[PDB]
């Protein structure tokens, strides 16, 4: 019941099964490919406080994976390390053979705690988590992944941004952005990676960082330089 697309004359036509068309020419298995695409390319929100809302925990359902031959470069990908309030791990260790997604411009690494009620974190829309040439129905601990879908057809540096959170598994989730080990700012859905990096440079340059052993949290004024009219990654 899985559709298979066929590309001819730069046109994508889904091949029917009920209607047999002699025109499709499969000469070798090298013409068959599994390609992973990211959800960011459809315009979904990518910012951490807006995307963790799409993930959630459940029990009684086992994980499954499939492989890829090719895929899209990601602007954004994630890496989670979430613990229960008592110190127990929420996410499972990745099994042998799982490695992080090979090409990301930004990695949003989130360290935190919360009410991790289920056994595994599943995607609520049915989308897959993408690892190095493997799509998975669940999130594995500590391993970088992109968020996306897979189609079947017949034919470098990155920046790590660190975040912290509490109440990770519920609606009242609080998020902070790390500037330094003792310096944080509040995170809001209006702050893109470029904004946040400019904000980080501004703080180091101004010197308004903790100079003691305790932590400091800054709020960002609601008036920001809103120069971008909700532009897509690609404009």
């Amino acid at each position: 019941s899985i559709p298979l697309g066929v590309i001819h004359n730069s046109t994508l036509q889904v091949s029917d099964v009920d209607k047999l068309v002699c025109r499709d020419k499969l000469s070798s298995t090298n013409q068959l490919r599994s390609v992973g695409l990211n959800l960011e390319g459809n315009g979904v929100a990518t910012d951490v406080p807006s995307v963790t809302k799409r993930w959630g925990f459940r029990s009684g359902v086992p994980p499954k994976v499939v492989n890829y031959e090719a895929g899209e470069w990601a602007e954004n990908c994630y890496n989670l390390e979430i613990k229960k309030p008592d110190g127990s791990e929420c996410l499972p260790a990745a099994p042998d053979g799982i490695r992080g997604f090979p090409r990301c411009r930004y990695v949003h690494k989130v360290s935190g705690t919360g009410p991790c009620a289920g056994d595994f974190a599943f995607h609520k829309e049915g989308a897959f988590f993408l690892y190095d040439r493997l799509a998975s129905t669940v999130i594995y601990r500590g391993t970088t992944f992109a968020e996306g879908v897979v189609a079947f057809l017949i034919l470098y540096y990155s920046t790590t941004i660190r975040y912290q959170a509490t109440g990770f598994g519920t609606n009242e989730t609080e998020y902070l952005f790390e500037v330094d080990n003792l310096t944080y700012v509040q995170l809001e859905s209006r702050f893109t990676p470029q904004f946040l990096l400019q904000l980080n440079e501004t703080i180091y340059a101004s010197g308004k960082r903790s100079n003691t052993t305790g932590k400091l949290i800054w709020k960002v004024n609601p008036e920001i330089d809103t120069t971008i009219g909700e532009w897509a990654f690609w404009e």
Partner: antibody
Framework: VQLVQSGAEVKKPGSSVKVSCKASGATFGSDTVTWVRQAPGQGLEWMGGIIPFFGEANYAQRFQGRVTITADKSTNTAYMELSSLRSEDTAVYFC?????????????????????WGQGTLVTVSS | GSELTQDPAVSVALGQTVRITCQGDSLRNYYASWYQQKPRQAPVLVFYGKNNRPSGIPDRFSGSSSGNTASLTISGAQAEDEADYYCNSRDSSSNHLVFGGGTKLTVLS
């Protein structure tokens, strides 16, 4: 948003007092909960404060070793405990929500302010 | 933290403009917040940052700063503005909240 403090606490010297503060309309989130002291005829002294997000506390030097400040996020309340009360500690103790704010538009500016104040708790120490 | 300095008392004729000052190290690279305290009431935020105030504060209250000196301007001071006023900043070298001594503003009504 409101902060509700406990009523008057009157005790003899040598006793300890625990003054509560309850948030209403909001959780504490990542804001700072700070306590200050208003002695009769005086100005405002900083006593100390916490960040419930992390559970850390800081104190004004004159109260180090005398004051403990904690919080419970399941109730969105905070508590300040004073030990070894003396008559000079008679004062109204105030609970407030402190915001450390950075202005990122145009010129860069930094400032702090207390946005939400409780009504104050009178603590009287006398033999 | 280094303490802020304020003159203990200021008198203003009713209807006149009054300037309340604050000085110290915590004002050198920051802005002071100002509070109005009525008898038997919690301090009320009046003005903060470089240029704004919370709603509920009338357009009599505005202010500025330079160097290590900050001030609150009350234009057309009203009888209703009699209050203790306080400046507040943060001494980042100790991370202590610092209040000035305040001032008593007497409106000569």
């Amino acid at each position: 948003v409101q902060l509700v403090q406990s009523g008057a606490e009157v005790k003899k010297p040598g006793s300890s007092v625990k003054v509560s503060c309850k948030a209403s309309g909001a959780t504490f989130g990542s804001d700072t909960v700070t306590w200050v002291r208003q002695a009769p005829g005086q100005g405002l002294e900083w006593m100390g404060g916490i960040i419930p997000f992390f559970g850390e506390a800081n104190y004004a030097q004159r109260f180090q070793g005398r004051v403990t400040i904690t919080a419970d996020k399941s109730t969105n309340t905070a508590y300040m405990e004073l030990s070894s009360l003396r008559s000079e500690d008679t004062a109204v103790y105030f609970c407030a929500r402190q915001i450390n704010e950075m202005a990122t538009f145009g010129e860069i500016h930094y400032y702090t302010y207390m946005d939400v104040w409780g009504q104050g708790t009178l603590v009287t120490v006398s033999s | 933290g280094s303490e802020l300095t304020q003159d203990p008392a200021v008198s203003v004729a009713l209807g006149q403009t009054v300037r309340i000052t604050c000085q110290g190290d915590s004002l050198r690279n920051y802005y002071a917040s100002w509070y109005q305290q009525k008898p038997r009431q919690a301090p009320v935020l009046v003005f903060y940052g470089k240029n704004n105030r919370p709603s509920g504060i009338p357009d009599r209250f505005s202010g500025s700063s330079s160097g290590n000196t900050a001030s609150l301007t009350i234009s057309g001071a009203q009888a209703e503005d009699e209050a203790d006023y306080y400046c507040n900043s943060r001494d980042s070298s100790s991370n202590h909240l610092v209040f000035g001594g305040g001032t008593k503003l007497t409106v000569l009504s």
